[PDB]
Design a protein around this ligand. Structure first.
Ligand SMILES: *[C@@](O)(c1nnc(C(C)(C)C)o1)[C@@H](NC(=O)Cn1c(-c2ccccc2)ncc(N)c1=O)C(C)C
Length: 240
């Protein structure tokens, strides 16, 4: 997250860190959202590689024992049937991970609430992106969970020429684009929390940014619109 601030320890309990084993250690690669005690929602492009993954919940500082972490393995990965490797502009950038074990819920580990199917947010809706991603373009990962106020940019504006044009689809959500704050490498697969009716719900799964850089003016961070896949999500968990 570029232009963010450190999130409080118990602010975003649904956030998880998706890690893969590199050598004899584990390294954070993407974010994700806990939606069931044994199911995690993330980006398809995060699990496109033939790597061994693990999930960490109750995580705050990547390199320090917080005394709240739970480490669980991934037992099954379900990518959207229409997902096309490396083709993030086509959409369908979403995947579900079935955990090897059910995690324990407490003040640091909670399920993120999903929006009702078809829900679209008004322009400039208050949202927050969270993650341990790069704090600067071509910089380095954050040590502690970061958060940044990222207001939505409706489809009409985001799909305009001065913005993303045809690259963005209606199955996506645009947030930010002020040139100061944004998502960045390592935030992928994570949640976009938006305030709706006094409650925070996960309306997006972080997908991509401009090839030019993370925080580019008029190039908001793009997310998969969660509300467009509620039926798919329910179908997967129900038969797995
Ligand atoms: C997303 O954070 C993410 N996913 N993988 C990674 C690495 C491996 C840590 C860099 O970071 C990142 N978004 C993207 O990387 C999306 N992206 C791609 C792309 C496509 C397929 C697989 C990986 C990456 N390609 C081009 C551009 N412009 C992208 O943003 C953050 C959300 C910024």
């Amino acid at each position: 997250v570029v232009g963010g601030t450190e999130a409080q320890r118990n602010s975003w309990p649904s956030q998880i860190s998706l890690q893969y084993r590199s050598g004899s250690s584990w390294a954070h690669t993407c974010g994700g959202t806990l939606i069931r005690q044994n199911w995690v929602m993330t980006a398809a492009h995060c699990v496109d590689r033939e790597l061994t993954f693990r999930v960490v919940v109750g995580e705050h500082n990547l390199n320090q024992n917080d005394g709240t972490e739970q480490y669980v393995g991934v037992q099954k990965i379900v990518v959207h049937p229409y997902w096309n490797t490396d083709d993030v502009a086509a959409g369908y950038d979403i995947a579900l991970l079935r955990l090897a074990q059910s995690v324990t819920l407490n003040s640091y580990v909670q399920l993120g609430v999903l929006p009702r199917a078809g829900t679209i947010l008004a322009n400039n809706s208050p949202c927050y992106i969270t993650g341990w991603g790069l704090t600067r373009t071509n910089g380095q990962l954050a040590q502690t969970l970061q958060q940044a106020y990222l207001p939505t940019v409706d489809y009409a504006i985001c799909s305009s020429s001065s913005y993303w044009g045809s690259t963005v689809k209606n199955s996506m959500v645009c947030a930010g684009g002020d040139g100061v704050r944004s998502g960045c490498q390592g935030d992928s697969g994570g949640p976009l929390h938006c305030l709706v009716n006094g409650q925070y719900a996960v309306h997006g799964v972080t997908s991509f940014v401009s090839r030019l850089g993370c925080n580019v003016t008029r190039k908001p961070t793009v997310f998969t619109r969660v509300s467009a896949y509620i039926s798919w999500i329910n179908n997967v968990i129900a038969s797995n």
